[PDB]
Amino acid sequence: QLDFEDVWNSSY
Amino acid sequence: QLDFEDVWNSSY
Amino acid sequence: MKNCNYKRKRRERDWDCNTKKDVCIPDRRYQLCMKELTNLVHRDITFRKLYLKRKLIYDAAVEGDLLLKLNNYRYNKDFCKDIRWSLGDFGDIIMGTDMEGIGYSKVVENNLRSIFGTDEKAQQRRKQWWNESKAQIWTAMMYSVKKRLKGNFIWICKLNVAVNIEPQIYRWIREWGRDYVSELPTEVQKLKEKCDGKINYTDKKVCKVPPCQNACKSYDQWITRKKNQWDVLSNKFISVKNAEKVQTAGIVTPYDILKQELDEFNEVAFENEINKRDGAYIELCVCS
Amino acid sequence: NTVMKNCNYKRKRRERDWDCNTKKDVCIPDRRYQLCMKELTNLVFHRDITFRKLYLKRKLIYDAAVEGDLLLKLNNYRYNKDFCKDIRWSLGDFGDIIMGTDMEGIGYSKVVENNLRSIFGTDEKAQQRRKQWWNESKAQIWTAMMYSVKKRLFIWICKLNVAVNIEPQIYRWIREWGRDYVSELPTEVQKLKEKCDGKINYTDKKVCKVPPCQNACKSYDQWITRKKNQWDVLSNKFISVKNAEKQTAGIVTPYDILKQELDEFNEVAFENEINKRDGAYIELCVCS
């Protein structure tokens, strides 16, 4: 239930 | 047949 | 997998000092989400390093999300610290200085040896990597928060504190001291309710009243686990503090840790409690 | 085109003539087609700083070394002018590929160009960034190409400044084409003289009644006709590209390039040859 890509993009 | 690491190291 | 589903209630399971006899493990560590790190495993080193950060960042966001939920979605001292405790554990696991090494943890380490190698300075490279990636890992843990406060998230928890490197035992002692002061009041309250006062003009209730005796036995068991936990943790602290550079900002004894993390800490009273010779205990549970 | 094949070996020089049929507005040299891009093709959402600063750089550096090694073998392991020019030509094309100003754009070159759009981005200033990346990397890439020679001794007979100097791709291709032209001319004229030189009788040239000679002249016509077409395509491409920029000093007309590449270059004689009105061709292949 967690969008992997948005997490990755947000990490920067 | 080329040492990838020796090439990388040599390029500096 | 289950570790990445539901975090057990805080203090539902107590610290485990039976698995590795020389160390005491917190339930939080046992539940540390490392699903991706586990199920992973070309030539290029820098490539695998990046494939690693990708999986770590995702595990961090899940871990953080679950800690937020465990805290009932509240931004407070308790949330920011669980983030610290768990961020640090990731750091140690990455740097190969973790004290757990159980089950799937052994696998995670094999996969890390498969990425950084096993040569002499391989350990140094694992340290620099982490010291370069951590701030992003922390940010990844703050995903659920950042998802909602959009930028102000950095005013909730302090970054410079979370990323600061500290030996694992150091952080665990803080967490433990925090748990101890949470439990103590409750346990002492249980005791008073049933044991306060005398049964006659001269004898304490504990002398004859069974409900009180039952309470005293329960307390004994509780305080005995604390006593054993502290002994193990504080001796591990000295051990680790005798096998490294061990130069820390104002930390000489394991008590100095508690003095930093707790308010008006008083070690004499603390030792009185864990050794069942504090005023409250004598008054309530000692027939003479 | 291919990718792995041309990273194992190169075809003999001038084995395949330049190609004007694939793209009508440009002639592509075989060397360009055989340009090694194996690693750069399998390059690839991981758009990290390290991805373009290290990973990308590493795969290109390795690509450079393989290219340089094969060019050395192509030159029969001779470390001379011709080897240095090949290194320069291939270095330049790598440069145009990175900077996204390559004129080939066929097969796997489209794949690479996409891989670079994902890495650097496709915004307005993405082009400039790719330019700076190359400018601050080309020196290292050149060194990698010399690895094979450097592995024996290297910075001397082959000059760095000459190679790293940026130049429109069409400029470099014209120089290369001129070198190939003057290598072929003597051979082709030789074939001609050895069949057509002189007269069959007192007043009539051999080309008038001697078939073997007539067939020789036919073959020459074909060669010179290809050369003619190739120069026309290249020289107009030069003017076309020059009109669309703001420029290279020392060079005004496409001939100025030939003057800078060849010794005692006569533009008038050159035009006579490719247009079959030079003294030699008239005497050997024109009956009256």
Residue numbers in the entry:
A (entry chain D), B (entry chain C): 19 to 30
C (entry chain B): 214 to 254, 262 to 508
D (entry chain A): 211 to 254, 261 to 369, 373 to 465, 467 to 508
Reported in the publication:
DBP is a member of the erythrocyte binding-like (EBL) family of proteins, which localize to micronemes and use Duffy binding-like (DBL) domains to bind specific RBC receptors with high affinity. DBL domains are located in “region II” of EBL proteins, and DBP region II (DBP-RII) is required for formation of a tight junction between Plasmodium and RBC membranes. Two crystal forms were observed, a heterotrimeric complex in which one DARC molecule binds the DBP-RII dimer, and a heterotetrameric complex containing two DARC molecules bound to the DBP-RII dimer.
In the second structure, two DBP-RIIs each bind two DARCs (DARC A and DARC B) creating two DARC binding sites. The directionality of these transitions is consistent with sequential steps in a stepwise mechanism of receptor binding. In the heterotetramer, DBP1 residues R263-I265 and DBP2 residues F261-D264 contact DARC of the opposing monomer. The heterotetrameric complex shows that the DARC molecules are bound in parallel, resulting in a Plasmodium proximal face and a RBC proximal face of DBP-RII. The heterotrimer and heterotetramer could represent DBP-RII binding to a DARC heterodimer or homodimer, respectively. The crystallographic and ITC solution studies presented here support a step-wise binding model in which receptor-induced DBP-RII dimerization facilitates formation of a heterotrimer that subsequently recruits a second DARC molecule to form a heterotetramer.
